[PDB]
Amino acid sequence: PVTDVKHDLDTLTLTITAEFAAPVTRIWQIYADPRQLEKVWGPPSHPATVVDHDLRPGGRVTYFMTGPDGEKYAGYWEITAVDEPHSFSFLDGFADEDFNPNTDLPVSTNVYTFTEHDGGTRATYVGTYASAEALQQVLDMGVIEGASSAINQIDALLTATHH
Structure with missing residues (x-):
């Protein structure tokens, strides 16, 4: 589940921390396999599609x-670094249905880090924004709700017992 959310005004960062009851190698595959990424991003009430997926530097x-x-929205990641299974880094932008930028917002820069924490995984998702105004606008769009949902969906995938 989600364990911390912090908006750091001094660094223009939004950091979400989660703890998962599965090994780092397992969590890595959530992001490395586009069908799993699509799953955690798309619970029944909020469908998602992963269209293109190439988790390697220079990939998208x-x-x-x-x-x-x-509201349906679209986005893209430009992958800048990949260090399996501990971290990957990327630039993220908002887009229209054709994946063309469709807002006046610059990209954010992002680093996801997965480290061993009690045989399980602590995941730290750090997003760095161009300005306070940009970050505020993304907060207002519900970025934290979406990120929290994905984290909870990951939790659900990690156990064979359901509610």
Whole structure:
């Protein structure tokens, strides 16, 4: 589950921390396998699609998601670094259905880090923004709700027992 959310005003960062009851190698595969990434991003009420996916430096991930209110939006990752299974880094942008930038927002820079924590995994997702205004606008779009949902979906995948 989610264990911390921090908006650092001094660094223009939004950091979400999670703890998962599975090994780092397992969590890595959530992001490395586009069908698993699509799964955790798309619970029944908020469908997602991972369109293109190439988790290697210079690669791209392109996706559709359903926002809190039901609005479809699109986004893309430009992968800048990959260090399996501990970390990957990328630039993220918002886009239209064709994956063309469709807002006045610059990209954010992102580093995901997965480390061993009690035989399980601590995941730290750090997003760095161009300005306070940009970050505020993304917060208002519901970024934290979406990130929390994905984290909870990952939790659900890690156990064979259901509710």
